[PDB]
Design a protein around this ligand. Structure first.
Ligand SMILES: O=c1ccn([C@@H]2O[C@H](COP(=O)(O)OP(=O)(O)O)[C@@H](O)[C@H]2O)c(=O)[nH]1
Ligand SMILES: O=c1ccn([C@@H]2O[C@H](COP(=O)(O)OP(=O)(O)O)[C@@H](O)[C@H]2O)c(=O)[nH]1
Ligand SMILES: c1ccc(-c2nsc(N3CCNCC3)n2)cc1
Ligand SMILES: c1ccc(-c2nsc(N3CCNCC3)n2)cc1
Lengths: 288, 282
């Protein structure tokens, strides 16, 4: 459930926070609208685990494994079992055009998997963009009844380290690994004013990655519905945004600020970008 | 909420403004210091919800003398541009000064009984706030902010503080280790906190949050005080001891820095304080 009020914790023994001696001095750990930016060294997972377990929190994790991408499912799910929300209730939702191709993966207690059979679009761009419609539709059909939070990711990925309840909040985006140190002028936003995804050169907080966002079911439903509607307007105007669903996600999160932002620890490509000292952990990485 | 177009400086992921202080708690609540927030963005967010902030103050006996300066300075500095409702609890309704209010701001005077012991005045604020959450606040304001009266605003105190539940770092202890915190240490008291527990020492003079969370906090503190009283014990720092026990077990969703609760006579103006926003009056 998502409790209405603050939860009451038991006695716990842990290191005292140090007001005058911050651990992370190398990165921004809070946005200008006071949302935390989640990096290793900013959170005590023991405190957060207690808070979320006291509410019997259930987390849904969506992936789209359409056409040849079914091949990524085995590694995605096996690594998720090792690293994603361990100790909490988890419900995997695999959207696929090939239910028979979903691999057998043994799950820990309190974790389950649903296979959602959906149509495959011809263009990869359309497969990627129609995720928004499909997520929104299923919020109404299944997710509002089944889970408290939804985490929506790309399937061509693997978990390498802890990804846990520190990410949970009403609405989050993730810093795209290619742009976390870039000026907003270098952000690859949609720059064409005719598109619903338009963002001018003098606007933008961050470039968020389309491959990892989430929130409460209600906020995810609203985000995905808004992005799908904006994509349909663009379609009617004969326009396709430069980076598809990611461009629309960026426009949405510019105008509706996320309540947490995840650092690139949560979305990385190690072959392309190596392992900068600013990244103490690589948690969720692209599969070649 | 859906924001209109705004132009402001881009946040810088690799070049944080505050490197001298902790700006987030281990449970991922921001700690509010100058340099961590853009008030333009936050003002938009809260105005779009037509946010009303209630501010409670208890002005009992001779403390009514602090009201004029408290209210005049609140008019310059507290939530300017938002709807404000002042709730002045006093034993002397006729002694409340006439203070001219800006548009969208109102004041209600609530008559209450004066206790003889200053400790009792301070502690019974918990019962009265909790009772008034039900009688009035829940139907009148969105957030409640609960402060001492013997104070003045000297700089901006705005919507950056608003959240479901907040406490404020006590200005005498922000640099102290938990062993030095003046928590209640007797296990006989409901406010008991062991030497190996505690995140921060929160000041009793500035807390708040949504009406529902404030009603819960103040109710719990009052009940714990009543238990202590039945057991013949009074916590070392009264309401503040109970507030600290409550916020230890129910983590606040924002923590305010001591910019928000200061005494310049006792503590000066250290480099770590870029602004002194709300300060004790001598
Ligand atoms: O034929 C396809 C194309 C894409 N996708 C889904 O859409 C996501 C985004 O596509 P992709 O990962 O190729 O985008 P990229 O990371 O390369 O920018 C994939 O991870 C899949 O989850 C899919 O299932 N089948
Ligand atoms: O006789 C009293 C005692 C206290 N108070 C209220 O209770 C708060 C706490 O009292 P005090 O300011 O003396 O506490 P201190 O800051 O000295 O610890 C005051 O600010 C007032 O708002 C009051 O009005 N009259
Ligand atoms: C520059 C451009 C892209 C990336 C990048 N990292 S992960 C990723 N994806 C998209 C494909 N699906 C898996 C997630 N892409 C990094 C730097
Ligand atoms: C050491 C001890 C107390 C303080 C201190 N700052 S403000 C404050 N109060 C309590 C009295 N009412 C006004 C608010 N007290 C500072 C340093």
């Amino acid at each position: 459930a998502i409790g209405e009020f603050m939860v009451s914790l038991p006695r716990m023994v842990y290191p005292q926070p140090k007001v005058l001696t911050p651990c992370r001095k190398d990165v921004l750990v809070v946005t200008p609208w006071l949302a935390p930016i989640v990096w290793e060294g900013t959170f005590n997972i023991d405190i957060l685990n207690e808070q979320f377990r006291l509410q019997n929190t259930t987390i849904g994790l969506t992936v789209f494994a359409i056409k040849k991408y079914v091949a990524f499912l085995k590694l995605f799910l096996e690594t998720a079992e090792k690293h994603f929300m361990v100790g909490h209730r988890v419900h995997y939702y695999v959207f696929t055009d090939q239910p028979a191709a979903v691999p057998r993966v043994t799950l820990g207690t309190g974790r389950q998997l649903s296979v959602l059979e959906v149509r495959a679009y011809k263009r990869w761009q359309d497969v990627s963009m129609r995720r928004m419609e499909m997520i929104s539709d299923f919020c109404e059909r299944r997710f509002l009844s089944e889970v408290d939070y939804l985490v929506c990711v790309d399937v061509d990925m693997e978990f390498r380290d802890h990804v846990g309840v520190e990410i949970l909040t009403p609405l989050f985006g993730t810093l795209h690994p290619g742009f976390y140190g870039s000026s907003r002028e270098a952000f690859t936003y949609e720059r064409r004013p005719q598109s619903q995804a338009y963002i001018p050169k003098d606007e933008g907080d961050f470039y968020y990655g389309g491959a990892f966002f989430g929130g409460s079911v209600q906020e995810v439903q609203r985000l995905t519905r808004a992005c799908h509607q904006a994509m349909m307007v663009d379609q009617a105007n004969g326009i396709e945004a430069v980076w598809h669903d990611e461009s629309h996600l960026n426009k949405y999160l510019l105008r509706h600020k996320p309540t947490k932002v995840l650092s690139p620890e949560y979305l990385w490509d190690q072959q392309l970008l190596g392992w900068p000292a600013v990244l103490r952990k690589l948690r969720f990485t692209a599969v070649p």
